[PDB]
Amino acid sequence: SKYKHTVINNSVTLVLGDAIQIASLLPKCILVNAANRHLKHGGGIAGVINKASGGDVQEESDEYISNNGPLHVGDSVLLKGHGLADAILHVVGPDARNNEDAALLKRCYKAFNKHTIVVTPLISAGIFSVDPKVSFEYLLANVTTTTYVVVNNEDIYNTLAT
Ligand SMILES: Nc1ncnc2c1ncn2[C@@H]1O[C@H](COP(=O)(O)OP(=O)(O)O[C@H]2O[C@H](CO)[C@@H](O)[C@H](O)[C@H]2O)[C@@H](O)[C@H]1O
């Protein structure tokens, strides 16, 4: 009630706000990180998540990658929550700057469905340069679990809330 939000369907609610704030307010959830293949959390929401954890997320990510190697585009890994959420699902969206196809978002978003409540940004809609409407369409097509999709730009919110 205390956020600008639009319920899209039985599963998906679009929220104008801060994903970390929204994950904090929910008693139980997974928070999704829009990550890169090497889980190097230098910027974007990955940066905000890592900094909110005081670097704990990067420490854990480094251990995962150091031992297990880089992820493939479209893959995800469930890691610890570091007090931000019950767990963080690191999802590697396609980077359009590197000619990676938006259709790989299908794989990203299908990974949500085994989790009861998910708080997510729009995957690949930041520097990975996928149209927010396209990302959101892939989300709605593939996500069947209770999901709060959080955007921090009112203009993008308004466009998607149509
Ligand atoms: N509450 C909220 N707060 C902040 N942002 C919110 C938000 N809710 C949604 N977002 C948005 O979520 C989006 C994520 O999109 P991307 O997949 O493009 O990020 P990316 O994969 O590039 O990050 C990766 O981008 C490059 C990859 O090389 C790396 O430097 C970086 O570390 C890695 O995370 C951004 O628009 C971000 O603003």
Swiss-Prot record:
What is the name attached to this protein's record? Papain-like proteinase nsp3
Tell me the organism: Bat coronavirus HKU4
**Residues of the Macro domain:** 1-162
Coding gene? rep
Location relative to the cell: Host membrane; Host cytoplasm
State which stretch of the full-length protein is shown.
Answer: 1154 to 1315 of 7119
Membrane topology designation? Multi-pass membrane protein
Report the superkingdom from the record. Viruses
Reactions mediated catalytically: Thiol-dependent hydrolysis of ester, thioester, amide, peptide and isopeptide bonds formed by the C-terminal Gly of ubiquitin (a 76-residue protein attached to proteins as an intracellular targeting signal)
Query: What role is this protein assigned?
Result: Responsible for the cleavages located at the N-terminus of the replicase polyprotein. In addition, PL-PRO possesses a deubiquitinating/deISGylating activity and processes both 'Lys-48'- and 'Lys-63'-linked polyubiquitin chains from cellular substrates. Participates together with nsp4 in the assembly of virally-induced cytoplasmic double-membrane vesicles necessary for viral replication. Antagonizes innate immune induction of type I interferon by blocking the phosphorylation, dimerization and subsequent nuclear translocation of host IRF3. Also prevents host NF-kappa-B signaling.
